[PDB]
Ligand binder design. Structure first.
Ligand code: HEM
Length: 471
């Protein structure tokens, strides 16, 4: 490994073959920050046997993300992750064909069906669980709270319900079944990073295999076939799998993968958002105020969804601070990469290209002043309208907040995710009293091993209590 003309700064580290494998794995954001300081906005580093070209200039992300698979490929790493984490291997298929197919079942008239179904499931699960436990305060971790209700409602919306004439007894069974899905799923979720790195102990391995075994049985095509009000998202996905001749037991494996892909972010996102509001009285008052004016003018007032500018900014800001996915490409053929300021750089076939929006634009102090601070109105202009104008190096940024990925490898459920988070926040702030146990609790650190998977998770939960509001 010697630099060719036109290639980025190259930094091999101290340890042979491994390189910066340890530093990157332990805390990728801290490590990559140091490397930005050392090398500027593009560098090639060696980590665990691979040469990773890191691009940290947000102005130059568009020259990379829209590139064809025959030049820059995202699918090889997804494929690898499917197998190593979820034990799914599927017949070769087109990712761009399937993403197009899937995204349609998550948009327009289907989204409207999902959005309506989501609100009644969120309501049924949240108010169902509170009514069962009774009218007093209930103590809970805020993550456990946010993740539980969103995943359980999300699961019931996408995977269907016990019954559709809709009874007291079917709704009660869905609360219990969905709680089982949540509690089992969470055991796998917690160990995802170790799964991906193959660092499970003998016991961890046995625990993971038993958890998978249960999840694969819960979400078997046979069990799902009896469920009512299944989503077009699900039904068309099942058909796609059948088309490829995938057996029912591998269908179940793929459905558990989809369970993670569709539910593994909303819960954690809402946790951080609610925590930031609980810690910032002026921010919470402005959110309450906006939702209350609409409430004063079981369906959801459409204005909560499409006319909540303060809430939109709160969600954008929350995600700015806590969404840390990797945008990752395999360099398929030797190529030239244009930077927005005139420069170009040579990418070598076999290298891995990594963009990390979390670091820039999201926590870039030249873009956002005090980027470490939650400022609820950061995405609002003084008149309360959505702020869309952000700058770096004397130029207006097209990409300034990128929690949903970019290019053709971006979130297929984004509108549904935003709508769902807003419905949950609305339900919590309007029906419930919600309180930190200790109002001076500090915001926990992330589990720093999770960088790159999507929404960050806290290294420990935050104790809260809630109740159905009494009068
Ligand atoms: C705040 C919540 C969410 C965030 C920040 C988020 C973010 C992302 C990101 C960054 C990706 C790119 C994949 C990657 O990182 O390599 C992605 C893909 C995807 N998203 Fe989301 N997501 C969220 C919620 C959801 C929801 C609610 C759904 C649908 C119910 C969904 C459906 C999908 C699917 C299906 C894919 C990949 C397609 C596949 O492999 O089948 N996401 N998401």
């Amino acid at each position: 490994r010697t630099r060719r003309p036109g290639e980025p700064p190259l930094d091999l580290g101290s340890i042979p073959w491994l390189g910066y494998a340890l530093d990157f794995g332990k805390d990728a954001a801290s490590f990559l920050t140091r490397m930005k300081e050392k090398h500027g906005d593009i560098f090639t580093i060696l980590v665990g046997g691979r040469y990773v070209t890191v691009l940290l200039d947000p102005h130059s992300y568009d020259a990379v993300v829209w590139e064809p698979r025959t030049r820059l490929d995202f699918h090889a790493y997804a494929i690898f992750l499917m197998e190593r984490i979820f034990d799914v291997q599927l017949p070769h298929y087109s990712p761009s064909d399937e993403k197009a197919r899937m995204k349609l079942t998550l948009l327009h008239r289907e989204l409207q069906a999902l959005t309506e179904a989501m609100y009644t499931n969120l309501h049924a699960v949240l108010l169902g669980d509170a009514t069962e436990a009774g009218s007093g305060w209930h103590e809970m971790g805020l993550l456990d709270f946010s993740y539980s209700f969103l995943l359980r409602a999300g699961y019931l919306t996408l995977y269907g319900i016990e019954a559709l004439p809709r009874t007291h007894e079917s709704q009660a069974q869905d609360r219990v079944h969905s709680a089982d899905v949540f509690h089992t799923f969470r055991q796998l979720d917690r160990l995802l990073p170790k799964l991906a790195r193959g660092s499970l102990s003998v016991g961890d391995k046995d625990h993971m295999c038993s958890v998978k075994s249960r999840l694969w049985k819960l979400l078997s095509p046979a069990r799902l076939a009896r469920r009512a009000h299944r989503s077009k998202w699900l039904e068309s996905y099942l058909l796609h799998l059948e088309e490829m001749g995938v057996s029912e037991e591998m269908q179940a494996r793929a459905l558990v993968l989809q369970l993670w892909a569709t539910q593994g972010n909303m819960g954690p996102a809402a946790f951080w958002l609610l925590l930031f509001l609980l810690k910032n009285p002026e921010a919470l008052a402005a959110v309450r105020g906006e939702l209350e004016s609409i409430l004063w003018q079981t369906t959801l007032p459409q204005k909560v969804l499409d006319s909540t500018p303060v809430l939109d900014s709160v969600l954008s800001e929350s995600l700015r601070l806590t969404a840390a996915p990797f945008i990752t490409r395999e360099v398929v053929v030797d190529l030239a990469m244009p930077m927005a300021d005139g420069r170009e750089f040579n990418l070598r076939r076999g290298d891995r290209l990594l963009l990390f929006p979390f670091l820039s634009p999201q926590r870039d102090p030249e873009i956002y002043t005090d980027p470490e601070v939650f400022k609820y109105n950061r995405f609002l202009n003084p008149d309360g309208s959505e702020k869309k104008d952000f700058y770096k190096d004397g130029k207006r940024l097209k990409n300034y907040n990128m929690p949903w990925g970019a290019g053709h490898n971006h979130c297929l459920g984004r509108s549904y995710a935003v709508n769902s988070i807003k419905q949950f926040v609305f339900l919590v702030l309007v029906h419930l009293d919600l309180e930190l146990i200790n109002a001076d609790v500090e915001i926990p650190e992330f589990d720093l091993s999770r960088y790159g998977f999507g929404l960050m998770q806290p290294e420990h939960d935050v104790p809260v209590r809630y109740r159905i509001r009494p009068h």
